[PDB]
Amino acid sequence: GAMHALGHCCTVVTTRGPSHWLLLLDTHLGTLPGFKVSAGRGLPAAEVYFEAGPRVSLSRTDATIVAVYQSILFQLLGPTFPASWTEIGATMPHNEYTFPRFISNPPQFATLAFLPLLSPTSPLDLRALMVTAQLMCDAKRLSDELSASLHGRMVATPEISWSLYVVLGIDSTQTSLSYFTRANESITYMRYYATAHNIHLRAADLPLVAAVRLDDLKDHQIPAPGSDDLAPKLRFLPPELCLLLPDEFDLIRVQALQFLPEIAKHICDIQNTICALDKSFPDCGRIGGERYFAITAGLRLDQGRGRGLAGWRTPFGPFGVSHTDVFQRLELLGDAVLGFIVTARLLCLFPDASVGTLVELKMELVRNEALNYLVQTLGLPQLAEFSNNLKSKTWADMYEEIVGSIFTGPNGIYGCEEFLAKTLMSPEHSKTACPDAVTKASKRVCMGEAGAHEFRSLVDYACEQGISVFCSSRVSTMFLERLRDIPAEDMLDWYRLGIQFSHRSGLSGPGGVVSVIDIMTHLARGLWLGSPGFYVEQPPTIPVLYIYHRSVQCPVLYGSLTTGPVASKVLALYEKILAYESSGGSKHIAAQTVSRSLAVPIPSGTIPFLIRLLQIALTPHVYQKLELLGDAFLKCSLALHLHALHPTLTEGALTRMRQSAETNSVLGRLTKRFPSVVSEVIIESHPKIQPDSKVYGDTFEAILAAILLACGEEAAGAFVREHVLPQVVADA
Ligand SMILES: [Mn+2]
Ligand SMILES: [Mn+2]
Ligand SMILES: [Mn+2]
Ligand SMILES: [Mn+2]
Ligand SMILES: [Mn+2]
Ligand SMILES: [Mn+2]
Ligand SMILES: [Mn+2]
Ligand SMILES: [Mn+2]
Ligand SMILES: [Mn+2]
Ligand SMILES: [Mn+2]
Ligand SMILES: [Mn+2]
Ligand SMILES: [Mn+2]
């Protein structure tokens, strides 16, 4: 293009070596997922690796010198390919796309050009191109112009479809006047070319060229001066037909060039997939190539059929990871964080619930049965394609894998929170005329004119009409009683927070629907996202605020500490837990010694709160819920750390791995490595207990939660990598 041109260091790799090219796109496609092409239509199997580079600028004059090189390439490609890279992709048979069923005609198509590179680092040379165009211009026939200096050189027959051949030497045994036979018939080459092609050979008296067609020499090695290793495919052709290609166009280039059409198809495929499925597949915030590979990993559940996933090419992620392997490890991780977020939020949504029922409720929301239904309402089954010769996989797994994708993508844990809040609660989860006095309240709620009793009326109504806004009948029922326990002066703020979130999520306008179902839903999402803390049973309220430690904030929903309608509640609880009169005996000392033994940098002035929780973690009947949360986080943090440390490992390995460092005996050991003052306090609280007890293990889990709650997600995850990760036992 003009200046609008982005570089990529495209590399085609065959059995015989690597070939380097500079791809130029006029479109931001981020990084392009490499792919590998199957054993070919006259070409060998190969692998194509990309990597983004400079943002190269081109003057009009230079851009047209590129255009020249292009046409040199198109000519070598032969008359079978339209002389435009766009037209090559934009006429692919549908069965060559990654999604033949969703071929969506993009408004734009990309505009690409290819240029040679001597190495993946050498700069773009424009003067070089012009020389190559000059040498091609000058390049003469074999008649004008030894059979050891021609060995391995590229030659094309421009009078006959511009086919490409590799010269093995000159066979003086025969001449265009010589004969060759096809069973029952013997003709002279000179007569053949006249009979078939309407070519009347001039220099007929010259010795034929012993060459082999590029189509035929699939991956085979070229022979020496001719000791001729594989000769049932050898061909002899008149020297006046062979146009000798310049030294730049060696065997390596010319073959790699046969794959450039696939790279054009790939970029084309990427673009289609995006503007066909980008709006129907939960948003991870990726763009271009990576968004493609995400949708591919996410919906192409099986592997290709012989030839490949998309046509003859099968895309792979970083470190040569199968798109299936990706889905496999993103499901594992996604499953692990869904557990974390659901734990942390249920913990606050039902502050009074026991660890017993929190666990029960989680499994009601994460259960296959439920996720399976959630995936149906997303309409993924319709888009997912597989050959059912792929057994143990479930619809429900798509949900987990998505959460994984969203998490590991640019949107972060914020994306996951958003995706869960859109999907676990939704008006689509109940059934439905309604009384008079109820429509009046609903109307008043929507235009902000609503107050205390209007909500009461609406709750009490839904509370008896059995309205379920969660994808669980138990959770929905339990949500309704949590609502009765919430001060009606508060409900207007929760609702606003819910509708606010619904708006930014793109699933509503600023106004609600004016139904008790929609109102019931918004109340839910508010309270899901924003409930401030949970109670530790018999002792104040522990505030959940690890979100405000996030290095990227979201004032629209959560606000800031210095103070909204939610932030204020959280802050309130925070100030009350500090002011708690510290009866600091030996526990308070253990808290302090733990406070400094974290071997990990914590945020500033966060200590006094950490001590308070570390105390709770170290008291006997109270750690229960902190343990629950710590357990949850540890799985998810460890899953992450391993996911990163082992880019090529799949479901089985990564599971067996983190399970080995998550066991109660293992965590217990780590608790004993703290100053003996800590072990002392544990044995002091629990009379006559033994080194193999469950309690050491669980207090570690409890401590991890204390760190998470008081210092935030990155401090807690640091503490995991520094202390828990080194205990993971290799599968070898
Ligand atoms: Mn079409
Ligand atoms: Mn003729
Ligand atoms: Mn990954
Ligand atoms: Mn409760
Ligand atoms: Mn599985
Ligand atoms: Mn699963
Ligand atoms: Mn009650
Ligand atoms: Mn809007
Ligand atoms: Mn555990
Ligand atoms: Mn690995
Ligand atoms: Mn005990
Ligand atoms: Mn435990």
- How much β-strand is present in the residues? 5-15%
Tell me the quaternary state. monomer
Instruction: Assign an overall shape.
Output: elongated
What fold name goes in the CATH topology slot of the largest domain?
Ribonuclease iii, N-terminal Endonuclease Domain, Chain A
Largest sheet, in brief, is: 8 strands, antiparallel
* CATH H-level superfamily title of the largest domain: Ribonuclease III domain
Ligand list: manganese (II) ion
Give the distance, in angstroms, between the N- and C-terminal Cα atoms.
Answer: 52 Å
CATH class wording of the largest domain: Mainly Alpha
Name the structural class.
alpha+beta
CATH architecture descriptor of the largest domain: Orthogonal Bundle
Q: Note the total helix count.
A: 27
**What percent of the residues sit in helical stretches (DSSP H or I)?**
40-55%
Please count the beta strands (DSSP E, at least 2 residues each). Answer: 17
Count of discrete structural domains: 6
Structural Rg: 34 Å
